[PDB]
Symmetry: D5
Subunit: 100 residues, 10 copies
């Protein structure tokens, strides 16, 4: 079963996705209306095989080159932390919350 | 069983997808032939796990950089509302209507 | 079971896809060396849930911007028609012919 | 079962995928280092449903516009031929070898 | 079962993925903060159907044109090596670690 | 003699170079920081030989294509009226006010 | 002694500049708002040193790449014809009409 | 009578060309290797006819669309200030310094 | 005393400007209607201050980057040689044949 | 009297121009056939009105953005130094040598 999901990433804020079973599918990554035409890199934080957490790069954006990146159903087992590694933002993210 | 689904969006229109075992899977978001070269942002509204409806960003389009965005089958459980978060319009949305 | 599928669209010549279950899965929609650097809109007409047929826009292409658009398997149940809403192509469409 | 696959093509060199259940799932198509900034139409030839051999376009690429098209799992039943409808090449095709 | 995966490749630096069913599903290939606006080719090395190892191109990137390529779940069987055939990045690679 | 001269143009605002000997030498026509990514056509109106005033196009600009156009001393004898044939601006004009 | 000089050119609409010393000094060639995004070539016709009349190319413009071009006072001796040897137009030509 | 002139600009600093005949002839306006891809508006401040100082826009720049702008010898009379109206540079201004 | 001057180039259609006081002022250098999107380079060969002929780059062109370049009245003393250092052509040269 | 000027510039060279009256008028700065699509910055060195030599930026170049920049008769009192502040090259320069 699935539910919509979305988050807005602003510079220096982490977006925590944890649930208090589940999986999280990432669809699109899009720059906001006010974002600066600078490089925007979006980082995701969740643990790897060997038990420890890590940061991965989902997408590298730029308004005048590539505003939106589609991941195709990138899923990560919660908890996951979404953040901008560089770039004012905002940067939108969407996908689905897969449950049960 | 899927059937073609489609909707055209533009300023002051909310396409309301409602059903009254039904799934709406989105494929493409493409700017209409009319569209000015301004930044378009398409968002979808629908419930999250907790039951509350969240506004979410499907994509950010701009005629001269990226007129179309492929979502690759983004499923959302109706009811769901689509619209332009900002941009004269028009913007086309394609996809499948999945049943039972 | 799959069979390669592809067609070419121009400014005037609709491609009809019928058989005599069967499924048509669209892959990528590209621009032909011929085509001008003008806005191309590939649309598809098929049946919706209320039995009536409808027109949906698969993609919007522009040679000097986005020559190729990929749909990652947009499945449509036949019959379906593939036409060029605007632009004159040649415009190529690949995909699979899924069967019973 | 899957194994990496890949091939390279330039202007008049076709490539032949063939074994002697089996499927070729194409992933990404991308211009390699020495490609001239000319148009690049990459195509495949394989059997359609009616039995004959059809030529189909996988992507239209241009080094300064779209150096890479991603088909994301486009499955074609061997035997299949890969070639440049036109363009000096090289053109890097990556994908998978799926087995019974 | 899935775990989050994320290498970082630089000019003559090589990433080495391996275990001790286990599958590797790549998601996005993208440029990082540094990376001068020069061509970029990311190639992968994992075994092919027969037994010999192949070098394959995952994508051709360029900062001023296309900073990100979404392979959308390109699964490769371990062990596997990711490297830049051209360019010098950094170039980030996200994906999943599929197990059992 | 040579004096500095500049103005601003925004549909909502026009310019009347009047000398109530003289010359108006135009240098650059450049898009203001807040201009939309729309098409801007700067127009100048003055006297031709035959005595009846005519409208002339000085430049055609687009922020993401060409923000500044240098006329390099396009001299015009007053009276003359600079104005935006289209685009809401603002467009800055710079140059010289030559005398005697 | 100089006066403003303009003119709007379209396919099949040669512009004749005739003076019944006198010199025509071309300033800017700029695409009109209607002008499609197809290549445009503006040519001018005045007689050469050896008597016979030549056709010369002034500028090659294209809306999405270079909407305006500064000739910077390219002076021709009348009579002279300005035409659009390529493209629909409209194309604007500004400049000065110098007199003795 | 000319001596090479030049100066660097950043949001931090201005430049004050004053001298105790003299003439300032500006040539090219260009972004430094360290300038970001933000919009850069360079302005000059010097007296007008009426005698009161005025701020004029010499050029709008953007690294990825128009790194350089050639003014072609825009002569201004000291004292003159050159500043970065918007953007942070560094931007370089070259030219000439003419004396009596 | 000026008269129109024009040229056209390809790898085998060069142009010698010789005469039997006299002066060639080059204006624009632009690519022609059907020449390929490859780099283009125009060089002119004429004697230097020490009598020996030098080879000089008039401009570097590329249809989708910059099809036209204005030299702005670049004067050279016959005999002069115009050629396409590289690039397919056609490549048009305009300017004026000055005399006495 | 004038003579053609020309020179190629590489990275960590220095092209000296001294005549042993005399003035150096610069025309077009253009990128060589094998320059990297990296950012180039051409510098010029000569005396300021106060005595000491000063470096100046003539033009910032980027192959896929601006391959050619036209200074349009930038006169410099030799001796003058012409170098590349940053860029592989080759970077061509053309102009005139004006004598006594």
């Amino acid at each position: 079963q699935n539910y919509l999901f979305g988050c807005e990433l602003k510079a220096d804020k982490d977006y925590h996705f944890k649930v208090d079973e589940h999986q999280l599918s990432l669809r699109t990554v899009s720059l906001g209306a006010g974002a600066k035409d600078e490089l925007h890199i979006v980082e995701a934080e969740a643990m790897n095989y060997e038990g420890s957490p890590i940061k991965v790069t989902l997408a590298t954006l730029k308004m005048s080159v590539q505003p939106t990146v589609s991941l195709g159903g990138f899923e990560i087992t919660p908890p996951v932390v979404l953040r901008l590694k560089c770039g004012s933002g905002p940067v939108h993210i969407s996908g689905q919350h897969l449950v049960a």
